[PDB]
Amino acid sequence: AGITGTWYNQLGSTFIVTAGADGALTGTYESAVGNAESRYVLTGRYDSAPATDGSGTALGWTVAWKNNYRNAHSATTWSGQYVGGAEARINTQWLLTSGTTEANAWKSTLVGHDTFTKVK
């Protein structure tokens, strides 16, 4: 599967990911320091038997931005695919939804993209 390990996005954010044989993604967001106050849980799913036609491996995961120290009242989902080979990558599009009032629901969800590599 090649997914398990530490991944870094284009801005250097760090994600520790374990790909279970059953399709589970588990792990954490860590800060550059790895301090407890900036650690958040991630959970998701991936295709544990991808196509053998050189297609990437579809996946997704979520981080809710609460831990025992901080709560931003928001959550991000990343949707994408893992691409193996010499320079393995996870190419994703993300949505960041913040909890809002109904009046402010229109501005609840930011969109962007993250590309993850096994090197900083």
Residue numbers in the entry: 15 to 134
What does the paper say about this structure?
As a proof of concept, we used this platform to identify both known and novel L- and D-amino acid peptide binders to the well-characterized model target, streptavidin. All peptides bind within or near the biotin binding pocket of streptavidin formed by two surface loops [1/2 (amino acids 22–28) and 3/4 (amino acids 42–52)], and by antiparallel β-sheets involved in an extensive polar interaction network, in which residues Ser88 and Thr90 of β-strand 6 play a major role. The surface loops of streptavidin are flexible: upon biotin binding they undergo a conformational change to form a closed conformation, but to accommodate the peptide ligands, loop 3/4 is dislocated by 13–16 Å from the biotin closed form to adopt a well-defined peptide-specific structure. All eight L- and D-peptides discovered in this work bind to the same pocket of streptavidin in distinctive binding modes suggesting (1) the rich malleability of L- and D-peptides and (2) the ability of streptavidin itself to adjust the flexible loop to accommodate multiple peptides with diverse sequences and conformations.
The same stepwise evolution approach was followed to identify hotspot D-amino acid sequences that bind to streptavidin. Two 5-mer hotspots, “wqeea” and “lanvd”, were selected for the extension step with all 160,000 possible combinations of D-amino acid dimers. All D-peptides fold into a left-handed α-helix with one turn for GyGlanvdessG and two turns each for the Gdlwqheatwkkq and GGwhdeatwkpG peptides. Gdlwqheatwkkq and GGwhdeatwkpG share high sequence homology; further, their conformation and binding mode are highly similar [Fig. 3(C) and Supplementary Fig. 7(A)]. In the common “wxxea” core of these two peptides, the D-Trp forms polar contacts with Asp128 and contributes an edge-to-face interaction with Trp108, whereas the D-Glu shares a salt bridge with Arg84. D-Ala is critical to the core motif because its short sidechain perfectly accommodates the limited space within the pocket. The positions “xx” of the “wxxea” core face the solvent and therefore are less specific [Supplementary Fig. 7(B,C)]. With the exception of these flexible loops, streptavidin has a rigid structure, with a root mean square deviation (rmsd) of ~0.5 Å for a superposition of all atoms in the co-crystal structures. The Gdlwqheatwkkq, GGwhdeatwkpG and GNSFDDWLASKG peptides bind with the same N-terminus to C-terminus directionality, opposite to the binding orientation of all other peptides.
